[PDB]
């Protein structure tokens, strides 16, 4: 088997340093927070997400595996990807949607 984030090419910089967060400008990124629910989404655009707290379980459509992202992971969701994001406990992130 190959890791799920490698097949979908979901880049994940885990435990990001401030030297990268201030380059990306994460302090200016929009906030989103979610508690405990399922969000089905299709990424029409690449999204760059810094998880400020909590955890997310992402299951690509039809998949039975998941990929897990934790606070301090910086995730690049690629466009055209369709996934169901599951949040089991209070969750907060900052995001920027990035066009070509």
């Amino acid at each position: 088997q190959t890791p799920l984030e490698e097949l979908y090419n979901v880049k994940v910089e885990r435990k990001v340093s401030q030297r990268r967060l201030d380059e990306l400008g994460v302090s200016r990124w929009s906030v989103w927070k979610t508690g405990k629910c399922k969000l089905p989404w299709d990424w029409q655009v690449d999204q760059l997400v810094y998880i400020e707290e909590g955890e997310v379980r992402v299951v690509p459509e039809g998949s039975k595996r998941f990929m897990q992202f934790l606070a301090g992971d910086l995730v690049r969701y690629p466009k055209w990807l369709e996934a169901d994001l599951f949040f089991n406990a209070p969750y907060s992130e900052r995001y920027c949607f990035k066009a070509y």
Partner: protein, 483 residues
Amino acid sequence: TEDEARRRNWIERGWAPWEEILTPEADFARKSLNEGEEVPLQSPEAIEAFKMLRPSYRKKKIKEMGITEDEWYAKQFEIRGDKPPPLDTSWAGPLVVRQIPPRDWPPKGWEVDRKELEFIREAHKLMAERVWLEDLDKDLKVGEDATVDKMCLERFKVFLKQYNEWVEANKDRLEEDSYKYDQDFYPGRRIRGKDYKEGMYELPFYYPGMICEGTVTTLHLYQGAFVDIGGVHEGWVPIKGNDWFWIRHFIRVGMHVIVEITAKRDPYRFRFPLELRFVHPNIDHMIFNKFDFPPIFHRDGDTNPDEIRRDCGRPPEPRKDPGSKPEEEGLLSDHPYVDKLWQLHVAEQMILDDYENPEKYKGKKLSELSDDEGFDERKEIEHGEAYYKKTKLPKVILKTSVKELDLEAALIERKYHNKLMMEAKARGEGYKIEKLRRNIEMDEYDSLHWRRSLEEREALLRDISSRQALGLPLEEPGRYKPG
């Protein structure tokens, strides 16, 4: 038109006149029935087939022609006619070669000395050096001065060090994984058990563009030639269908060949992990039935078509064009947590509606309330039925735990709004609460979600304009089709 349909059968329907080896009674049938229902047979060939119906006559024919009867049993399998024009295959100059380490070294998850690996990897820049046939012969080292000790192969020797260390650490794991995943041996599979020889080249040793001497070990009509190139996997030259009708004359089993590795695939996903091309018996002018994609396995662990395609590079499953345009749709404001907030809201209100039977709640705080006995946390939802006016509907039952509820502050609002409702009675009016703190919170979550949908749409508009200017695809290329 007969010949046009013959061509259409060859090219499209995959026809070929594969010669049929017939028992002498079936041949006698396939000849005599050309002449009539019960006619006295006239054709010399049909009379000959009628005579051949006795094996004693076949014996006599053997003795008269002198061919030994096993040689005749062999000769009956001879190709019926029209043998193709011999191959005239000519080398495009000398085969000039470098021992360059594979680029996909080390294998995934194997750790090596990165300074040795950088030394290995410096060899790959050598591929940019020109070589001219007007320049090879003037400096050519030959004989004693071309003994191996004269050659600078040090980056390759370091590669060989790391390779042998990897083989020593992994040959057993890879044999176990072969027996685990592959039930039966087949040419593309890892040679294993009593057939493995110590010193077979492992798959990391090969790379596209490497040239190999090998032996053609098997032909499969629907897959192509398989070649021992010294590895634990046979290399695969893709040849399919009626192309073999000619190639069967040139590419026999047991031939020695020179082949070029053209792709190297993952042996777990892909059925044949080394694709090859025949270099010396160059047959490129007779391979018409190309494979669109390299064959794969669909395995016990596979469970999602999309995940297998992107594990092997196949195009996605088509869908009907939705006819909506992505950027013209609405913005999803409705945050999915708000439904759960709504449950929590009404749960708080339910609790407060029981706290305003106050005698039941004496002696404890609201934040001190527990769940009841038997509180099954392991399912949020029950299902059942409900009735009104002699008819039935489904009922969904949503459990909420008292640990989830902001009961103290909800009580603070409850008491505050009760006091205001009494002042409203002193105003002489009703008291519409416009929102509670839960409705405000739900609106905040909706605002966060709408903000995402806005920033997504705006980035989508920029993306669209960029891709339209640059001719890049807007929707995923394979995802949609009209039919």
